[PDB]
Design a protein around this ligand. Structure first.
Ligand SMILES: CNc1cc(-c2cccnc2Oc2ccc(Nc3nc4ccc(F)c(F)c4[nH]3)cc2)ccn1
Ligand SMILES: CNc1cc(-c2cccnc2Oc2ccc(Nc3nc4ccc(F)c(F)c4[nH]3)cc2)ccn1
Ligand SMILES: [Zn+2]
Ligand SMILES: [Zn+2]
Ligand SMILES: [Zn+2]
Ligand SMILES: [Zn+2]
Lengths: 306, 318
């Protein structure tokens, strides 16, 4: 890995760059540094990464780049709270992040439900997410893709459960209740990492934090990333109008000029609470929150027209 | 029901102590009959008001008090002070520790110098004291745990009587290990091992042996906390530490042995150097490593560093 990369990949606000064919290397480097060189047989891990790459789609935002970007955010959390995590979590969380939007079409669970898509009948709740985990399992069962083959049966069931819960937690609908419970557990001191269900919840929050990490980048990356977010959402809003459903203003390209107030509302309602609470629980994740605020400042500055 | 009347109640300190006992550099003050209350409070906030049966807990504390001796440093005040530091470490890392570990660690700290006579393991060995024949390493520390177990065996004194046998044994191990770890001789090996494990990333709190080591370093850090207090307190506490050591040096001379300069009253003027050496060689690396493993314990390092500054100021003569 190049000098600049080695240094800057430790920073929370690292951008993985425009060279797609370095991203596998970057991910492998992150597994090595946060899990270990002997965590995975290198050959199987490359075949697995490439097969995952292949089942991500050429969509504006929810693509291979976002999959690797999210995994990096996870990496930086792992490295800055490294004593906290089991060897199983050191193995399965980065993988969970890399697989967490497998085969995303660029469409919400709402759209899938309104369209009456087969996945909506097959998975009634967190529809895309149950699908991302189903894709993950089936890639794992391809000959030579069981990167967990040396684990015991028990250890294999456990890490898949980590991957499952982690991926499900990326459904933004579950985030609100989850963060409420965690807030109230931290204020009252009941929160405890020796309690599996509390540990699950924190991982869930770590995953929301990683999924939304584009708001913790420096302003130029965050602004440019917003073009990609909205390109998807506007395409979905287009498809809503074709069904004959007025889409919400978030996904309606005719409301472009209201994007700045749109972002502001979201940093206040969702992103700031998310990272604020995560910073309470894992203080060394503060740089994420700090960046989020700087970007919240930049949207107000945009709204003022300066 | 008593578990029920104890659930309604919460213990209350004066306003100044409520606020400042949360601070790492808090001093427990000169009022001895306040310290039990101080301890019970810390137990209630870091553990919960149903961890111990209050009557049993008071009986236990009075017995522990009665088994500390009237020596200048390793006395009842020291015990409670060490327990406080552990309380602050617990409160600032609240999501890390089990209920048992919280129960047991505060109790361990309070009991960790039980029946200390003001003499090092080294003096006991040279004196040929009976304890040295019985415990050939960490002599005093095994005795401290031994006394602890004896207090718990007294009628109406088993504060862990409500635990399952399984949990009782776990807490007694947490306490045994913790107390043994205050043998400063074992600290150097322990810290070195943790510094390596932290730097390579192998350090993992879900592994019992690693966790034991961290707990060990936590115990060292609390044991030496006198160096993390504000300057006026560290300077004054220093009198008490040297009163002890000098008296040991006196007893070594009585055996016809030259005591090391650290325990030799004839070398009063080299104390500033001596402390400079100790901060450089022991205290700074201890809290440096602890702050590394547990970032919220930093204020201990910051304060340790400020006192190192004060000792240099004395050496220069300023
Ligand atoms: C909603 N879940 C989600 C969010 C993001 C996301 C991550 C980081 C930043 N933004 C993200 O998406 C959002 C985009 C817009 C909004 N809110 C919003 N935009 C508006 C534009 C016009 C308008 F009139 C509005 F009312 C808008 N509201 C929120 C998240 C990505 C994927 N899924
Ligand atoms: C060593 N074990 C120990 C130390 C302390 C302790 C805690 C905080 C501060 N000091 C402590 O004890 C020490 C006292 C002195 C030294 N070093 C030292 N002092 C000297 C004075 C004169 C002289 F000539 C010297 F060489 C000295 N060396 C270290 C710890 C408490 C309990 N056990
Ligand atoms: Zn998703
Ligand atoms: Zn996502
Ligand atoms: Zn001791
Ligand atoms: Zn002690």
């Amino acid at each position: 890995l190049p000098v600049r990369l080695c240094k800057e990949i430790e920073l929370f606000h690292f951008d993985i760059g425009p060279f797609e064919n370095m991203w596998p290397g970057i991910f492998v480097y992150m597994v090595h540094r946060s899990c270990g060189t002997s965590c995975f047989e290198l050959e199987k891990l490359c075949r697995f990464i490439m097969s995952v790459k292949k089942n991500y789609r050429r969509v504006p935002y929810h693509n291979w780049k976002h999959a690797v970007t999210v995994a990096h955010c996870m990496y930086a959390i792992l490295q800055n709270n490294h004593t906290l995590f089991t060897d199983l979590e050191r193995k399965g969380l980065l993988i969970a992040c890399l697989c967490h939007d497998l085969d995303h079409r660029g469409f919400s669970n709402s759209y899938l439900q309104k369209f009456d898509h087969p996945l909506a009948a097959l998975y009634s709740t967190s529809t895309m997410e149950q699908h991302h985990f189903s894709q993950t399992v089936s890639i794992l069962q391809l000959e030579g893709h069981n990167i967990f083959s040396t684990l015991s049966s028990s250890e294999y069931e456990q890490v898949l459960e980590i991957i499952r819960k982690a991926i499900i937690a990326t459904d933004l609908a579950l985030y609100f209740g989850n963060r409420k419970q965690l807030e109230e557990m931290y204020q009252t001191g009941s929160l405890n990492l020796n309690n599996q269900s509390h540990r699950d919840r924190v991982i869930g929050l770590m995953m929301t934090a990683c999924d939304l990490c584009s708001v913790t980048k420096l302003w130029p990356v965050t602004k440019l990333t917003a073009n990609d977010i909205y390109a998807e959402f506007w395409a979905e809003g287009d498809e809503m109008k074709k069904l004959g459903i007025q889409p919400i203003p978030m996904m309606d390209r005719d409301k472009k000029d209201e994007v700045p107030q749109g972002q502001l509302g979201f940093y206040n309602a969702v992103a700031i609470p998310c990272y604020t609470t995560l910073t309470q629980i894992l203080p060394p994740t503060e740089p994420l929150l700090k960046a989020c605020r700087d970007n919240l400042s930049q949207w107000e500055k945009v709204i003022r027209g300066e």
